[PDB]
């Protein structure tokens, strides 16, 4: 099985002019400066790139690169795409449920995993953590065996790296360079690219490539190179590093001069004459990506206990401060500023979806071209993994404790009411941080986004301002608002049988008005309706704004630029 | 001149056991693991950790480290310290104004910067913008030479560099060290630590020392360590680069077997009989710390202009959404919502302060090591610089803009008491936040905790709960809340003359109680005085908090952990 | 308690209008709001605007820039200022009083008509 | 706004008859809703306010019975004294519009 290229250009800007050669079953290596092409290079043979922007021919075995390539060949990024917060047993789990057929065994999937972690020496780890930040785990060195393992589940003969030697130390580096090199012999075809390499590195290669500023420099077998540059004009001086002194060339101890000396290289020649001799299911893909994020989820405590501590504290005071909502004067301001803030807080509280998306971007990305699930699945079992429990949870903390506390209506439906309201306006400002999250790998730019928004919003939410004592051309931005319509329902579910004028019976006749001596004075003069409609047309607002906003992350996950 | 040390001892732990030799008037340089003392013992020679944790002596020239040590030597951080929103004459003149002589001409501050910057390369930089991510500079391999230039003023005769290497490319890095060479031979002891070096850079020493794991290996000039360690018992093979053939001993190809080879070498034998012969003003720090914040203040609009724009928008927007508040039943809500407003908006951006002391955190620690200024003259310029600029804009672009489109109070002294009250609760919450954050070099902490103060003293506030009716073991806590005072103070200047029942003169009498129909019932209701010393209570408490806050910051400035 | 107004009962089209109320038995800077009506021919009524009892004022938003309210308080009057007088508002006028507490227009004027034409 | 529809533009009732006269709003007015009663050639009458309650310098005949939108004034057994323009007037909001008015006959 061998790699094969020809006269590739590849734009936008053409850092790049034409490269050339094969790769043969063994260990093919790219190296160079970081401004090189040696990155772009390795996106391109593992077809992570835009296919408009490439210009020449990937031939394999004498077989173009079919739709079935991705599906049998392995990529790894350069940073840890583990679930750090689950084990190795776990994650390969996950990553054999969605590359396996579904016809073979789970039995089969419990033995191929254990012909793969054996291999890889990761035995004693299986159900050890891998690690986080705030969960003491497994080191590094073999974070980066567990990426590799989560990329030979289907047994790919052809591997890809992105820098495999970055971000761990030396002898860290090289017990995953001596595991590769275990599988530089069991056929398997590994292609990656290392910056600052070194020569215990490079004493085991069987191919290599060196790019420059877009130039190719050398292909052939990693042994001549020494050979070659020799006849360039230089000498590598008494001890100095040999994959060092290759890039003592480079910058001076100009780059027209190297690439016409690679031109008329016999290197190249042979490769030219060999070149143009080649040249001449979905309840499944849902039944585990539910599970892997779930576990992140159980396996984070500083930010799932740690936000719903938040949210019992925040519970109690807030039933410390009110407890026990007058029906004198000031119980209209008490009503209205609680519902305010348990709306506002709702609201405010998911500008942490930011985070979900943002974070599991690249992970994303990584994993669909792989081609482990369909997008569809992917948005149908993350949200059911994390906005649906995050989100159940403190609409049901907030509503059990300050309702009673509070002495909130006392009646059974509105309990209820207000449960479900709360849900749906956590479920809303969540949705619409995920629209404007989604396809965006920074997050000091959309949290700043979503801040002003909301901010925006709650003036029209009702209390900072009266609706109707707006101007008309800005009374049509009163509906463009998600902390309007939850408490707009909750004023509506709370101020319907109360009275605030004790003394003052108001609802057969209301003497000497400007009083607002009753619910429905104060409801009334905010805007909103008296009708039972009034209160599920707010529901039926923000379910409906759900789905528009889950849309437009749907399609800007779906059109995004993946490449 | 040389330094010498003997016997360090140094723990909170000790990742030490005692470390002998002396350094000659040369390039003295230090190599290991992230993990040994490399990093530990460069702040042990530059006086940068605590004394009590130090043990043995440090003597130069035979005398001991004086108070007067740090006042004439230079240590360069590992980041980029140097300010590049400035230039390099901007920058090299704010370095020589606070380390020369009073005594010395402006004519001499002119000439000894030409002294270095003419030595430096960095003559066609001079008035060229160093660099930010949004304004485009130098390259970052002058920014290391702009830091340089900054620790070689009053001409230091001993150099201390943390990490020559790391953070620029091979090339770039070489241009540096040729630079260090040139400064090697005119009487400039420079002492660093390079994470891996390569042979190029090893290739130019004059002395050389090697740690592991808190382990002294190596002791003596830079060219015998391919000549000791091959007595060790390896061999350097076949074309290895010798610094990485160094650390090639180190994890296995133990850490007490290769200390006793040390304990026993001749290097430490002659290093023996060496250390036991020798073992045997306020105005003018305040006129330009405040210059180089100004010119920070001035070259970021992403950051100044950008939270100008901001304000002027919501000016106006606060300005459209209101417009002309009514005297009718309605107008109670709306004054009230839009002082609520604007008190609520001073405090949140108050929080971006934290961006002013933690980004510049660690340059003021190295800074005042170093001994450019008292702590107070940072503080009293500082502040001087962008605590007071950026804050009395905005309380005066708000003020200008929604006072008059609002209608607010059409007197002239109402004005500018609004003026007022906005620029003090600025600088309070301004100052609440800058206690918060003194002394932190984390920024999602505090913004965190930031937030959560702010999200109480606003329940408090009292728009979202009236204060009276809270229960007496809570109502002293609404006395540590910021945004009370301003929008009592507001509260006070503009509902004094008002009305807001149309057709019912409420100020001789109010028929019909339960109507708020005058400014002075809605005041009143909320718990707010009605004798003028109420409005300047607010004022006061406010000063006050300034005082106080500045003060908490002012000490954990000064009691903290600077080594 | 006691209004009347007093004013010219015809005018030329597009120039202006000038309607007065001198209030007796009361004092209109002690208690009340002060409003016109008008009431067309086909009869419709349409309040008009009123003035506070401190100068403030609030007008009909369909009658925007044509009506004023002025007043001259030491001899309790207030003035009706319609300008640009299309001749299709050729109504009868009134000066009207409102409580604020009852709420309602407790006290009506006597009537002026008011025809627009030339 | 808030327009009130005097939906009955015109009565044919006679004496001692009660009659019923409705006043459609387009809006909550929470008993915010005058009965005036212009005799021709006079300024409106004030005849209820609050709409339950009354104004001195009537019989009590003129009762309102309104509740929501569905406001209503009843006169029971009318005197010859009592055929007029009755406009109802809501003064919830500020642009206090009346009713269209009807007008009662003698058949």
């Known amino acids: 099985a061998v790699l094969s290229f020809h006269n590739i250009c590849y734009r936008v800007k053409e850092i790049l002019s034409n490269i050339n050669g094969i790769m043969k079953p063994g260990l093919n290596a790219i190296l160079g400066p970081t401004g090189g092409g040696k990155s772009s290079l390795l996106d391109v043979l593992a077809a992570r790139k835009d296919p408009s922007g490439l210009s020449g021919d990937v031939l394999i075995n004498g077989a173009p690169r079919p739709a079935n390539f991705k599906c049998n060949s392995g990529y790894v990024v350069q940073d840890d795409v583990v679930m750090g917060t689950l084990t190795v047993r776990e994650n390969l789990q996950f990553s054999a449920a969605l590359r396996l057929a579904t016809t073979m065994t789970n039995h089969e999937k419990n033995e191929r995993i254990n012909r793969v972690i054996q291999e890889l020496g990761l035995d004693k780890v299986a159900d050890s953590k891998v690690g986080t930040q705030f969960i003491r785990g497994v080191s590094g060195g073999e974070r980066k065996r567990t990426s590799i393992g989560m990329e030979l589940i289907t047994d790919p003969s052809i591997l890809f790296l992105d820098e495999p030697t970055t971000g761990l130390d030396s002898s860290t580096a090289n017990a995953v360079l001596l595991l590769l090199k275990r599988m530089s012999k069991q056929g398997r075809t590994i292609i990656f690219s290392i910056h600052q390499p070194r020569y215990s590195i490079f004493k085991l290669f069987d191919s290599l490539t060196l790019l420059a500023s877009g130039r190719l420099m050398f292909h052939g077998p990693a042994q001549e190179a020494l050979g070659y540059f020799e006849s360039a004009g230089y000498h590598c001086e008494a001890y100095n590093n040999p994959a060092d002194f290759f890039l003592d060339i480079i910058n001076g101890d100009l780059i027209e001069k190297l690439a016409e000396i690679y031109v008329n290289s016999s290197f190249y020649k042979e490769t030219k004459a060999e070149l143009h001799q080649l040249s001449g299911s979905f309840c499944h893909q849902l039944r585990w990506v539910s599970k892997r994020s779930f576990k992140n989820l159980l396996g984070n405590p500083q930010a799932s206990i740690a936000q719903i501590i938040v949210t019992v504290v925040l519970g109690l005071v807030i039933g410390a401060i009110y407890f026990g909502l007058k029906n004198d004067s000031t119980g209209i301001q008490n009503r209205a500023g609680v519902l305010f803030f348990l709306t506002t807080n709702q609201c405010f509280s998911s500008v942490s979806a930011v985070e979900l998306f943002v974070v599991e971007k690249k992970l994303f990305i990584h994993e669909y071209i792989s081609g482990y699930y369909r997008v569809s699945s992917y948005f149908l079992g993350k949200l059911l993994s994390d906005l649906l429990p995050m989100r159940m949870l403190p609409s049901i903390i907030f509503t059990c404790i300050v309702y009673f506390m509070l002495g909130l209506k006392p009646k059974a439906d509105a309990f209820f009411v207000m449960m479900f309201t709360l849900m749906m306006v956590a479920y809303s400002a969540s949705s619409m941080a995920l629209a404007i999250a989604a396809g965006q790998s920074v997050v000091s730019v959309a949290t700043l986004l979503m801040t002003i928004c909301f901010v925006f919003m709650m003036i029209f939410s009702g209390l900072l301002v009266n609706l109707t004592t707006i101007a008309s051309w800005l009374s049509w931005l009163q509906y463009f608002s998600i902390p309007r319509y939850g408490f707009t329902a909750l004023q509506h579910n709370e101020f319907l049988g109360q009275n605030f004028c004790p003394g003052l019976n108001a609802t057969g006749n209301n003497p000497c008005n400007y009083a607002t001596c009753t619910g429905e004075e104060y409801l009334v003069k905010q805007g909103i309706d008296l009708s039972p409609w009034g209160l599920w047309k707010n529901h039926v607002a923000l379910a409906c704004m759900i789905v528009i906003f889950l849309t437009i992350a749907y399609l800007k996950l779906l059109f995004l630029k993946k490449y | 001149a040389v330094l010498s040390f003997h016997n360090i001892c140094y723990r909170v732990k000790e990742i030490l056991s005692n470390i002998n030799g002396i350094m000659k008037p040369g390039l003295n340089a230090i190599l290991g693991p992230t993990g040994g003392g490399k990093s530990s013992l460069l702040d042990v020679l530059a006086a940068r950790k605590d004394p009590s944790g130090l043990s043995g002596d440090v003597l130069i020239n035979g005398a001991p480290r004086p108070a007067n040590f740090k006042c004439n030597s230079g240590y360069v951080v590992q980041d980029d310290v140097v300010m590049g929103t400035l230039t390099v004459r901007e920058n090299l003149q704010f370095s020589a104004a606070l380390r020369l002589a009073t005594t010395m001409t402006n004519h001499e501050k002119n000439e000894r910067i030409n002294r270095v910057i003419q030595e430096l390369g960095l003559d066609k930089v001079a008035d060229s913008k160093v660099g930010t991510q949004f304004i485009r500079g130098v390259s970052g391999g002058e920014r290391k030479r702009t830091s340089i230039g900054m620790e070689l003023i009053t001409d230091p005769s001993i150099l201390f560099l943390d990490e020559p290497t790391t953070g620029l490319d091979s090339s770039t890095a070489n241009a540096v060290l040729l630079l260090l060479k040139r400064m090697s031979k005119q009487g400039r002891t420079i002492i660093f630590s390079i994470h891996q070096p390569r042979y190029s850079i090893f290739k130019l020493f004059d002395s050389l020392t090697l740690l592991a794991s808190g382990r002294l290996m190596f002791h003596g000039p830079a060219q015998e360590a391919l000549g000791y360690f091959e007595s060790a018992g390896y061999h350097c093979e076949a074309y290895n680069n010798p610094a990485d053939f160094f650390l090639d001993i180190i994890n296995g190809d133990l850490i007490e077997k290769l200390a006793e080879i040390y304990v026993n070498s001749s290097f430490y034998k002659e290093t023996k009989a060496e250390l036991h012969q020798l073992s045997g003003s306020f105005c003018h720090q305040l006129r330009w710390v405040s210059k180089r914040s100004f010119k920070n203040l001035l070259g970021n609009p992403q950051a100044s202009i950008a939270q100008i724009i901001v304000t002027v928008v919501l000016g106006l927007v606060i300005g459209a959404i209101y417009f002309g508040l009514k005297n009718d039943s309605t107008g109670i809500q709306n004054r009230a919502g839009v002082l609520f407003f604007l008190t609520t908006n001073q405090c949140f951006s108050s929080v971006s302060a934290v961006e002013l002391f933690v980004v510049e955190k660690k340059l003021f620690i190295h800074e005042y090591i170093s001994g450019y200024y008292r702590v107070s003259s940072y503080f009293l310029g500082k502040l001087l610089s962008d605590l007071l600029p950026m804050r009395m804009l905005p309380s005066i672009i708000f003020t200008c803009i929604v006072y008059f489109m609002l209608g607010l109070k059409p007197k002239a002294d109402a004005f500018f008491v609004m003026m007022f009250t906005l620029m003090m609760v600025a600088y309070s919450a301004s100052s609440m936040a800058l206690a918060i954050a003194a002394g932190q070099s984390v920024v999602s902490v505090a913004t965190l905790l930031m937030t959560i103060c702010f999200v109480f003293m606003m329940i408090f506030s009292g728009l979202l709960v009236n204060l009276t009716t809270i229960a007496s073991w809570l109502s002293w806590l609404q006395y540590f809340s910021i945004p009370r005072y301003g929008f009592t103070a507001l509260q006070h200047n503009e509902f004094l003359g008002q009305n807001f029942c149309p057709g019912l003169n409420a100020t001789g009498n109010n028929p019909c109680n339960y109507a708020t129909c005058t400014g002075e019932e809605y005041l009143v209701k909320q718990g707010i005085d009605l004798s003028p010393w109420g409005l300047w209570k607010n004022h006061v408490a406010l000063a006050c908090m300034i005082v106080i806050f500045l003060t908490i910051a002012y000490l954990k400035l000064l009691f903290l952990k600077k080594y | 308690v006691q209004l009347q107004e007093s004013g010219p009962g015809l005018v030329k089209p597009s120039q202006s209008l000038s309607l007065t109320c001198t209030v007796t038995?009361?004092?209109?800077?002690?208690?009340?709001?002060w409003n016109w009506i008008r009431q067309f021919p086909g009869k419709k009524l349409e309040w008009m605007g009123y003035?506070?009892?401190?100068?403030?004022?609030t007008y009909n938003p369909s009658l925007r820039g044509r009506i004023s309210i002025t007043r001259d308080t030491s001899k309790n009057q207030f003035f009706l200022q319609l300008r640009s007088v299309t001749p299709e508002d050729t109504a009868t006028y009134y000066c009207?009083?409102?409580?604020?507490?009852?709420?309602?227009?407790?006290?009506w004027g006597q009537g002026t008509s008011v025809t627009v034409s030339s | 706004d808030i327009v009130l529809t005097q939906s009955p533009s015109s009565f044919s009732v006679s004496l001692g008859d009660r009659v019923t006269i409705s006043c459609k709003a387009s809006?909550?007015?929470?008993?915010?809703l005058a009965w005036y009663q212009q005799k021709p050639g006079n300024a409106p009458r004030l005849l209820i306010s609050?709409?339950?309650s009354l104004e001195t310098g009537f019989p009590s005949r003129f009762s309102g019975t309104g509740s929501g939108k569905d406001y209503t004034l009843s006169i029971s057994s009318l005197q010859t004294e009592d055929v007029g323009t009755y406009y109802c007037?809501?003064?919830?909001?500020?642009?206090?519009?009346f009713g269209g008015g009807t007008k009662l006959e003698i058949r």
């Open positions: 009207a009083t409102f409580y604020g507490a009852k709420g309602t227009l407790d006290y």
């Open positions: 038995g009361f004092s209109i800077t002690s208690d009340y709001a």
């Open positions: 809006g909550y007015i929470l008993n915010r």
């Open positions: 007037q809501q003064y919830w909001s500020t642009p206090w519009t």
């Open positions: 609050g709409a339950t």
């Open positions: 003035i506070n009892f401190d100068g403030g004022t």
